[PDB]
Amino acid sequence: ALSLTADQMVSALLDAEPPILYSEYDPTRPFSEASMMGLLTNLADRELVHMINWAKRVPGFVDLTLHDQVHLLECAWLEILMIGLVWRSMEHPGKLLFAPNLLLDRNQGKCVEGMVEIFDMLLATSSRFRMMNLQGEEFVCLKSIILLNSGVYTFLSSTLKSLEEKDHIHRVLDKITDTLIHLMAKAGLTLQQQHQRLAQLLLILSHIRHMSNKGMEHLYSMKCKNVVPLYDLLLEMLDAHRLHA
Amino acid sequence: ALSLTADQMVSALLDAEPPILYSEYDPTRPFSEASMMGLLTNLADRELVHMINWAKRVPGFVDLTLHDQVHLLECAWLEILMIGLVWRSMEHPGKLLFAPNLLLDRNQGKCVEGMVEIFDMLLATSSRFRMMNLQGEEFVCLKSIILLNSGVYTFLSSTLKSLEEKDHIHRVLDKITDTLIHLMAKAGLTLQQQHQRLAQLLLILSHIRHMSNKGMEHLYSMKCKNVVPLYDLLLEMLDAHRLHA
Ligand SMILES: C[C@@H](COc1ccc([C@@H]2Oc3ccc(O)cc3S[C@@H]2c2ccc(O)cc2)cc1)N1CCCC1
Numbered sequence: 001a002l003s004l005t006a007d008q009m010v011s012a013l014l015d016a017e018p019p020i021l022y023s024e025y026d027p028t029r030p031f032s033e034a035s036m037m038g039l040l041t042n043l044a045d046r047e048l049v050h051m052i053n054w055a056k057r058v059p060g061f062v063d064l065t066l067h068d069q070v071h072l073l074e075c076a077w078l079e080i081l082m083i084g085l086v087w088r089s090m091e092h093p094g095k096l097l098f099a100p101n102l103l104l105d106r107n108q109g110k111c112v113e114g115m116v117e118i119f120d121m122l123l124a125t126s127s128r129f130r131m132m133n134l135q136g137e138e139f140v141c142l143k144s145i146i147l148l149n150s151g152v153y154t155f156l157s158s159t160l161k162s163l164e165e166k167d168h169i170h171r172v173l174d175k176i177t178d179t180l181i182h183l184m185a186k187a188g189l190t191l192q193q194q195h196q197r198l199a200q201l202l203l204i205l206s207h208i209r210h211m212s213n214k215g216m217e218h219l220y221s222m223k224c225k226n227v228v229p230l231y232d233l234l235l236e237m238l239d240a241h242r243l244h245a
Numbered sequence: 246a247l248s249l250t251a252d253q254m255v256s257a258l259l260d261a262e263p264p265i266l267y268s269e270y271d272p273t274r275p276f277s278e279a280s281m282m283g284l285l286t287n288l289a290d291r292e293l294v295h296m297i298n299w300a301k302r303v304p305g306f307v308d309l310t311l312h313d314q315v316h317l318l319e320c321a322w323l324e325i326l327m328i329g330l331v332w333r334s335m336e337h338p339g340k341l342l343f344a345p346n347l348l349l350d351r352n353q354g355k356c357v358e359g360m361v362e363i364f365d366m367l368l369a370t371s372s373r374f375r376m377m378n379l380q381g382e383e384f385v386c387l388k389s390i391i392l393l394n395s396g397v398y399t400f401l402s403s404t405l406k407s408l409e410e411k412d413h414i415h416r417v418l419d420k421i422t423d424t425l426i427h428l429m430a431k432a433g434l435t436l437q438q439q440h441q442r443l444a445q446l447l448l449i450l451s452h453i454r455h456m457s458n459k460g461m462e463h464l465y466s467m468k469c470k471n472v473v474p475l476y477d478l479l480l481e482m483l484d485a486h487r488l489h490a
């Protein structure tokens with residue numbers, strides 16, 4: 001990502017995109033019988049495996065230590081799931097496309113206590129994306145910034161290693177800024193519109209953080225999975241051998 | 246803020262800055278006897294009055310409806326308190342300057358259950374500001390963006406009035422982006438450094454949001470004041486007559 005061109009970062013990120021998964025329920029069977037949170041939790045857990053694969057293809061990420069990769073993902077995984085959900089919901093006003101076979105409106109969120117509040121925030125984000133005409137190339141840049149940025153301030157220590165890690169991350173974020181600006185210039189925005197649009201995009205990331213924080217608060221009202229710490233499951237997933245090479 | 250120059254926004258914001266308040270405790274008396282949360286809560290409540298005064302001097306803010314002013318402040322007040330705290334702590338590594346007569350280190354945070362975690366996040370933000378060499382002129386721009394941005398996505402409705410309000414806010418944020426870019430150009434940064442520094446600044450705002458959200462979670466473990474809704478107290482403060490004109 002540090003000698004990669006702007007055109008090469010954009011292609012690398014497009015190449016890395018995870019697949020769109022389906023909800024797992026029998027579509028020949030009724031709906032009142034379904035646990036909406038079970039459906040959503042099962043979907044999200046399945047996406048997480050693919051998020052790990054994606055993160056390893058973000059330029060610069062695997063040059064980090066395993067521990068720092070785990071930390072970043074532990075800090076950003078729900079933001080990353082949510083921006084992906086808002087992105088595929090963009091062309092579906094008033095609805096959230098959790099999966100191609102699971103498209104829910106706000107009243108379907110009332111089904112779970114405290115969940116309509118989260119739905120409403122997600123829906124508003126999707127509407128802002130649509131109104132901004134967010135582009136596929138801009139979205140993958142944003143998703144990678146979330147991955148690199150959300151946990152970069154909470155690394156405990158400040159060892160030599162740690163200082164080098166933070167420098168490298170800030171260097172990669174810098175190149176993704178250069179890429180976003182490059183995309184906007186290519187599109188024919190003036191200098192002035194570029195910086196304004198860059199700021200508009202980056203401020204949405206503070207809303208996504210808000211949504212992740214609220215969603216974490218909401219998810220922690222027990223019912224879901226909280227077995228084995230998240231660190232450990234992420235590490236297991238991230239700490240791959242190379243035998244299947 | 247919409248026909249204001251970049252030089253006029255910067256001066257308007259510098260002019261609007263609130264005063265630095267002191268902690269209210271008898272400095273002739275011992276410390277173990279002090280409620281650290283009482284001291285911090287009393288300080289923060291006193292700052293809030295001055296925050297309302299400041300917000301009314303941010304270009305564009307008072308052109309909003311009273312209700313929308315209340316909403317923005319309800320969404321941003323803790324972020325705004327925290328960025329002010331990190332800013333005055335910048336030149337005090339390892340310590341948080343809550344007031345000139347109340348300078349606390351992380352171990353003094355352990356005094357309150359769950360508070361050291363918040364202190365540690367604040368301290369790390371202060372260190373990042375220092376390392377970035379954040380400037381007084383950049384800080385007031387950031388503080389005003391927080392005020393305008395944090396609640397702009399959660400307005401319920403979408404009345405004509407509401408749509409006009411959102412447009413105006415996004416227009417003001419745009420001019421503050423123009424101002425930040427103007428400040429950086431004046432300082433002699435290249436085009437490339439400007440956009441990179443703009444992005445570095447705006448991404449810190451996602452960390453400040455995180456800290457506010459965590460702090461709200463922490464403050465809600467009862468002991469503090471939660472009497473009369475915050476909306477209502479903000480409204481009271483904001484809904485001024487003009488008789489003392
Ligand atoms: C905690 C469990 C389940 O996590 C979940 C479960 C459900 C969802 C909910 O469903 C999805 C499903 C896929 C997707 O890409 C996004 C979301 S968001 C939504 C949600 C989030 C928070 C909230 O308060 C209400 C709804 C999102 C995450 N595992 C997640 C991976 C590690 C543990």
Ligand SMILES: C[C@@H](COc1ccc([C@@H]2Oc3ccc(O)cc3S[C@@H]2c2ccc(O)cc2)cc1)N1CCCC1
Nearest residue numbers: 285286288289290293326327330363460463464469470
């Ligand atoms: C809720 C009460 C008190 O709010 C407070 C009380 C204390 C502080 C704590 O003390 C200050 C004091 C001044 C300042 O500018 C910032 C902070 S931050 C800190 C804090 C915040 C969250 C947390 O979990 C732990 C420490 C910040 C806000 N009133 C606030 C205005 C309306 C109600």
